[PDB]
Amino acid sequence: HLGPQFCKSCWFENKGLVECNNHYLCLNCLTLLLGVSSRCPICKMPLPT
């Protein structure tokens, strides 16, 4: 299925992750990357809410 349980942006947070279209993000990275665009900068797909 999906990959490991980590945030692919900061590489170190592993608690309280929300699922992307195919992987996980931490809340801090989510609220930090929501301000640039709605597309996942890694998946090239829109981020859910």
Binding site: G3, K8, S9, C10, L32, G35
Partner: protein, 1415 residues
């Protein structure tokens, strides 16, 4: 017995060459042993064929060089006695001949290099007598000739061999040695083991073998090894938890790493600097940096200068200085007449002007010398002081026009406008007369390419100054142009060495002065746009960061400053700093690192510029790796990795080779003196004492007291333990692992003056004279040939000590005396594998190289192939097989994709710390279940143990000079003390045999096998002690270890036990000779292997690496080969990470470099309009086809339709491949219309058919000092580029009559036609459009032109064969068999000198259609 004798006498009387000489040998033989004279007549036939083939006079009377020199009246002193086979005298030019025939390639190459040595000695000797000789070597590997038929000679040799079956010849004569060499000379061995040797091994072999067997068990059970491993691990963990063993692995803390990097160089760097102060200080740091950002505000003289430069190479007259003076007067008048009309002073600096040969001559000196010359000419006799100069100027211009007309320069092309010769020239020449930084330091923003453009202009000026011939104010100068101004770079020193340049202007005088090295500023010669664009790309990587947006501009300025700083100041210290930065950033994002990391990252920096670079790097990291970023670490890591790999922009060559050679010798010698085996003068004839020392050191090497001792393991100490070696051997045995005198007097007087030009004289005297008393032999004979010798040496030593039948006639014809006949425990009775040490350039640090003769080469090759066969039986290593390496890449991607732990290890001092004795020991204890072969490997490794290494002459000469200076006129190093102690007793180190030296390369596969088995055993021990599997991949220098899920969860839940296991791994590896280097890293995200980095299963681009590789690789070969090289490099780069824009810019930069060299760019060179599809699934031919389609957009469509129909009818239609091979050999221009009419497609009209391209290599290839398919299967970068620019201006192109001429002559003859238009598209593709009227009519220059449509069809068909038939759509092995079948003569000549399927078109479309190689 006389039956065969009379038979061969009849044979020689019937079949023999009776030209004028061999009848004498026949009558001298028939009165006389059969085999000897048979070989003698054969070799004499070879010799007469050699002297008649090389046009040399046969030397039959055994006359040496002294006889030849006495018969001509040349009196020479006592020199070397050598007799040639042929000689040729032409004035001061002698041609010498030496011939020999050898069956074994080893003996052949040995005699080749021996003849080379004797001939270079003879040339050096006769040079001291001013006699120029040219050598010639006739080495014939076969016995064939042109006097006796082949089968007749074979029958003769077979009769000799059948008469060798008797015993009377063997017992009466033919002693063992000479008879053996005679039998091997007539044999056909051509040496896979060659075991037919005389084994007389002494007891020392058994001593060494028993040394590898005592104490070691190697026959344990698979259960006891596990118990011993468990107990050792328990004791180790206990002693670590107590504290007697120091920890070697520390947890990573980003804050602590950043603080330790910032505090680096705290004793010389003040503190953290702001970006503004950095930009302020950068723009005024160095003179070259001051020149940048300084806000600095036809051509009749240039035409005359270039014209006189063109006629200067031909040596029109033996009046060198007078020619210079006349050309100076002419350029003076030209500049006067050009400056009066409309132009200002362009080539002036103030009381001095740039004359021919791009040199600055002061106007006052010109006036003075011309005045003296004209008055001296006027003393002899009326002309009124001006008719003389006018007449001589007419003579010079007439001679120049004649010397340029016979080659066809067509002087009118230079736009000289030859009216400047005035009758009032003398008067016009005599009446002619013309914090410390002058400008404002710092005005230009760091966003425009003005700084890069000025840097490119300066670098081009430097590299053009590098090539000044400097024949005979004397300061030379180059000129470099700019916008509203143009400047002059002045310099006095010549050559390719580093010198002191001065940037000057006419309006302000001197502007800058700096000591620079010319050959290093290459990657910035024309890199105007590619550098800015790659910096823009690197910034766009981290542009979408959302946390550095308020500072990204500062980041960009910083990066550009770093780039300009490393390009304007290429220093090896900067390269080392950037590589250590790479190591740091690699170890930054990991989980554990080595305690000695910071001591390795820190590198000694001087000159105050490297400190600025370090401050820039520190600020850049503080900006990108600030505490509050926590977003897209991948992009930032890639950015920093590229900033570190930016080191490639600097040239990898060494500034001065003496210092790097001393450094290499230091790295070579330090561990040996640290260990205690430095035996000097190995004394090939083995003595007992060296053997005693050898066996004692071998015994000491095996102690390596483990952790069970009192003190404990001494890390970084060479030695292997007996217990662990026994464990390894036992685990491998069972199924567990795999499952002049005046000069000398002047030097002495200069030394005396210095005590109470001369310095160089004293240095040369000490380097060439003191070494004579320690002659220990290339450089020794070189110094002896430059000098009576005995008396001078004795006087110098006193003055320095005061202040303190196997004959000869058959040896050159039948057999050789160079082959080993016996062998003992030291070597094959001829040499104990003597090597020579050299250095190989690399990016960070130079590597070592052991070069040996052919016998050593084949011995090491035998051992290498044996161990490679052994390793191929396994499936763990990845060194030279692409399949296992690809499998390793796949496994690494799979493991990293699941966030597993990865241990990237490098091993410090892998070369000097390994040992052949270790390999011998680990070999003698294995079983190798299925004696011949094994004893051979054993004795070969024993030979490797007794190894000689020749100390280079440069380093020993430097140490001798330093010793002399210290004895006559301070923290001496280890090697310095060693050399001084050796000199204090009289002996000089020539070879140092030791135990602890594995050759860097000569033992590659065996080292790989040893590393493989050892790492497999270590991983097995770890798995049995913890409960987790470990995969390993090695490359004989550094390796990767991939852990399973158990170790990952263990690290996640227990750091202490994990670090305990890691330190136990370190301890077991150090018990072997596997010293783990501090660069090692244990990281769960990034993985390094063979300079390949993996972050999330993907691969990092490493953009700057490929960009610098493309900007660097420019050789001096033929231009099409250069285009091929650049295309391969850009293909690789686009394949890995590089986008299309940078690669297009690199291609355009290469084309511009080629334009500067004045070359007729042809469309078959490069395609710089890429839209990236032809790099993923396209070859070079498809790219050239796309370029041509872009050139002529109409005919390409018709030809593509024709070829599409033809390919469709070929692949699955009527068979036509049988007649096309001959159809493609007729007239091409007619054949196109013929085939278009045959297929039904409308042929191209006359307009779109006359297009042709200029092929200078139509008759012969360019003389870059028959098809190309039959030939392909057979210094520095700046020097190469300047040589390319120099040849492409000289007589490079050849004519049909085998005559040389200039390209400018070809353009001139083209300009003498009324048909062509010379139209190019956008960047100078320069394709012609000659009409077909003059097409090959009267053998004119149209012969060089070649039609474009035919070659377009060739290339399109080639691509259709190679990669599918979709290429024809609208743009929206057995080859040698076919070569021999179609071209028999071409298959005979220039093919194999030392060595149905639908492919006949692939070989037929290039042997006639001279476009590319196509294969």
């Amino acid at each position: 017995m006389e039956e065969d004798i009379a038979c061969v006498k009849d044979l020689v009387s019937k079949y023999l060459a009776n030209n004028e000489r061999l009848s004498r040998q026949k009558l001298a033989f028939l009165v006389q042993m059969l085999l000897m004279e048979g070989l003698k007549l054969l070799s004499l036939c070879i010799e007469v064929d050699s002297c008649n083939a090389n046009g040399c006079e046969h030397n039959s009377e055994d006359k040496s060089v002294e006889r030849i020199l006495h018969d001509h009246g040349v009196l020479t002193p006592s020199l070397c006695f050598v007799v040639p086979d042929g000689y040729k005298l032409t004035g001061n030019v002698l041609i010498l001949l030496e011939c020999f025939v050898r069956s074994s390639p080893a003996n052949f190459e040995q005699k080749y290099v021996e003849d080379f040595k004797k001939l270079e000695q003879l040339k050096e000797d006769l040079k001291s007598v001013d006699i120029n000789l040219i050598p010639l070597i006739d080495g014939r590997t076969s016995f064939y000739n042109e006097q006796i038929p082949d089968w007749v000679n074979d029958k003769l040799r077979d009769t000799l061999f059948s008469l060798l079956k008797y015993a009377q010849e063997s017992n009466s004569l033919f002693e063992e040695s000479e008879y053996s060499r005679l039998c091997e000379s007539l044999s056909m061995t051509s040496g896979e083991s060659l075991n037919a040797l005389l084994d007389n091994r002494s007891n020392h072999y058994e001593e060494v073998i028993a040394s590898c067997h005592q104490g070691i068990n190697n026959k344990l059970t698979a259960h006891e090894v596990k118990l011993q491993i468990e107990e050792e691990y328990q004791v180790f963990r206990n002693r670590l938890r107590k504290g007697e063993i120091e920890g070697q692995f520390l947890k990573v803390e980003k804050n602590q790493l950043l603080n330790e990097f910032n505090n680096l160089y705290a004793d010389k760097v003040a503190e953290k600097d702001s970006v503004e102060h950095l930009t302020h200080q950068f723009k005024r740091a160095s003179p070259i940096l001051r020149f940048l950002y300084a806000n600095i505000s036809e051509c009749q003289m240039q035409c005359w200068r270039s014209f006189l430069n063109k006629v200067k190479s031909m040596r029109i007259l033996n009046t060198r200085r007078k020619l210079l003076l006349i050309f100076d007067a002419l350029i003076l008048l030209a500049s006067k007449h050009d400056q009066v009309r409309k132009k200002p002073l362009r080539g002036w600096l103030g009381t001095c002007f740039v004359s021919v040969n791009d040199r600055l001559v002061s106007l006052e000196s010109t006036k003075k010398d011309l005045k003296k010359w004209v008055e001296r000419r006027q003393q002899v006799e009326c002309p009124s002081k001006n008719q003389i100069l006018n007449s001589i100027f007419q003579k010079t211009i007439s001679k120049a026009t004649t010397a340029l007309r016979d080659v066809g320069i067509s002087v009118d092309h230079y736009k000289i406008d030859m009216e400047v010769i005035c009758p009032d020239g003398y008067d016009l020449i005599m009446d002619f007369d013309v914090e410390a930084f002058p400008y404002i330091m710092g005005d230009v923003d760091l966003l425009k390419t003005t700084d890069l453009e000025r840097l490119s202009s300066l670098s081009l000026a430097l590299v053009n100054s590098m090539k000044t011939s400097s024949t005979v104010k004397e300061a030379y100068c180059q000129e470099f142009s700019l916008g509203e101004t143009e400047f002059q770079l002045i310099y006095q020193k010549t050559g390719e060495c580093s010198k002191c340049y001065a940037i000057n202007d006419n309006r302000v005088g001197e502007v800058c002065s700096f000591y620079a090295d010319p050959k290093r500023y290459f990657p910035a010669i024309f890199s105007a746009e590619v550098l800015q664009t790659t910096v823009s790309t690197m910034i766009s990587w981290i542009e979408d960061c959302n946390e550095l947006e308020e500072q990204l501009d500062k980041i960009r300025s910083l990066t550009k400053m770093i780039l300009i700083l490393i390009l304007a100041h290429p220093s090896k210290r900067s390269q080392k700093l950037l590589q250590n930065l790479r190591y740091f950033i690699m170890a930054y994002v990991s989980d554990y690192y080595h305690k000695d990391l910071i001591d390795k990252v820190r590198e000694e920096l001087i000159t105050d510029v490297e400190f600025l670079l370090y401050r820039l790097l520190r600020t850049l990291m503080g900006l990108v790796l600030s505490e509050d970023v926590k977003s897209m670490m991948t992009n930032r890591f890639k950015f920093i990795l590229n900033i570190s790999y930016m080191c490639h922009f600097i040239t990898k060559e060494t500034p001065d080779r003496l210092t790097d050679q001393i450094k290499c010798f230091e790295k070579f010698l330090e561990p040996k003196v640290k260990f205690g085996h430095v035996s000097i003068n190995p004394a090939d004839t083995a003595t007992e004492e060296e053997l005693d020392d050898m066996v004692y050191n071998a015994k000491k090497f095996l102690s390596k007291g483990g952790c069970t001792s009192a003190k404990g393991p001494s890390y970084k100490k060479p030695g292997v333990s007996k217990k662990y070696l026994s464990l390894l051997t036992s685990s491998f045995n069972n199924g567990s692992l795999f499952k002049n005198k005046l000069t000398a007097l002047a030097v002495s007087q200069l030394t005396e003056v210095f005590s109470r030009d001369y310095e160089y004289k004293v240095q040369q005297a000490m380097s060439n004279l003191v070494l004579g008393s320690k002659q220990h032999d290339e450089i020794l004979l070189d110094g002896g040939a430059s000098t009576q010798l005995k008396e001078t040496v004795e006087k110098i030593v006193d003055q320095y000590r005061e202040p303190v039948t196997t004959a000869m006639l058959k040896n050159l014809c039948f057999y050789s005396q160079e082959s080993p006949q016996s062998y003992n425990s030291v070597g094959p009775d001829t040499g104990r594998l003597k090597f020579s040490l050299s250095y190989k350039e690399q990016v960070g640090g130079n590597r070592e190289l052991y070069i040996g003769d052919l016998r050593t080469k084949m011995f090491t090759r035998l051992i290498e192939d044996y161990f490679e066969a052994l390793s191929s039986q396994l499936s763990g290593s990845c060194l030279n097989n692409e399949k296992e390496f690809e499998n390793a890449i796949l496994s690494m991607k799979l493991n990293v994709s699941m966030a597993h732990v990865s241990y990237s290890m490098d091993h410090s001092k892998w070369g000097p710390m390994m040992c052949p004795f270790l390999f011998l020991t680990v070999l003698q204890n294995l079983i190798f279940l299925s004696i011949k072969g094994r004893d051979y490997l054993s004795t070969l490794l024993m030979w490797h143990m007794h190894k000689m290494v020749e100390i280079p002459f440069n380093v020993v000469s430097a140490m001798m000079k330093s010793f002399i200076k210290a004895q006559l006129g301070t923290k001496q190093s280890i090697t310095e003390d060693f050399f001084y102690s050796n000199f204090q007793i009289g002996v000089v180190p020539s070879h140092i045999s030791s135990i602890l030296d594995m050759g860097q390369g000569i033992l590659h596969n065996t080292s790989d096998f040893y590393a493989l088995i050892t790492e497999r055993f270590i991983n097995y021990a770890i798995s049995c002690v913890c409960g987790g599997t470990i995969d390993a991949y090695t490359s004989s220098d550094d390796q990767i270890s991939l852990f399973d899920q158990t170790l990952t969860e263990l690290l996640h839940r227990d750091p202490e036990e994990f670090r305990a296991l890691m330190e136990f791994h370190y301890y077991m590896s150090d018990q072997l000779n596997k010293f783990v280097s501090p660069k090692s890293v244990i990281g769960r995200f990034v993985a390094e292997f063979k300079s390949r980095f993996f972050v999330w299963g993907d691969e990092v681009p490493l953009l700057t690496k490929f960009v610098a590789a493309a900007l660097h690789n420019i050789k001096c070969k033929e231009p099409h080969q250069l285009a091929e090289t650049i295309d391969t490099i850009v293909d690789q780069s686009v394949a890995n990470g590089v986008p299309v824009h940078l690669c297009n810019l690199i291609q355009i930069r290469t084309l511009s470099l080629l334009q500067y060299a004045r070359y007729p760019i042809d469309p078959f060179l490069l395609n710089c309009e890429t839209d990236v599809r032809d790099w993923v699934d396209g070859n070079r031919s498809y790219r050239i086809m796309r370029q041509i389609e872009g050139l002529i957009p109409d005919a390409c469509s018709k030809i593509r339709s024709m070829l599409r129909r033809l390919y469709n009818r070929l692949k699955t239609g009527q068979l036509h491949e049988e007649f096309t091979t001959n159809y493609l050999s007729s007239e091409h221009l007619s054949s196109l219309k013929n085939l278009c009419e045959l297929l039904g497609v409308e042929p191209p009209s006359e307009s779109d058919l006359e297009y042709s391209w200029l092929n200078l290599a139509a008759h012969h290839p360019l003389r870059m000092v028959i098809p190309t398919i039959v030939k392909t299967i057979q210094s520095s970068i700046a020097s190469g580029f300047v040589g390319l620019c120099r040849t492409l201006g000289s007589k490079c192109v050849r004519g049909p009559n085998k005559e040389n001429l200039y390209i400018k002559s070809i353009q001139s003859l083209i300009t003498g036609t009324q048909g062509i238009e010379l139209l190019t598209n956008s960047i100078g593709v320069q394709y012609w459009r000659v009409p077909l009227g003059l097409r090959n009519k009267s053998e004119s220059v149209v012969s060089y032109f070649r039609p474009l449509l035919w070659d377009y069809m060739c290339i399109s068909l080639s691509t259709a064969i190679e990669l599918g038939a979709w290429v024809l759509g609208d743009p929206k092995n057995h080859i040698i068999h076919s070569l021999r079948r179609l071209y028999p003569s071409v298959f005979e000549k220039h093919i194999l000198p030392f060595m149905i399927k639908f492919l006949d078109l692939c070989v037929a479309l290039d042997v006639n259609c001279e476009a590319l190689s196509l294969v």
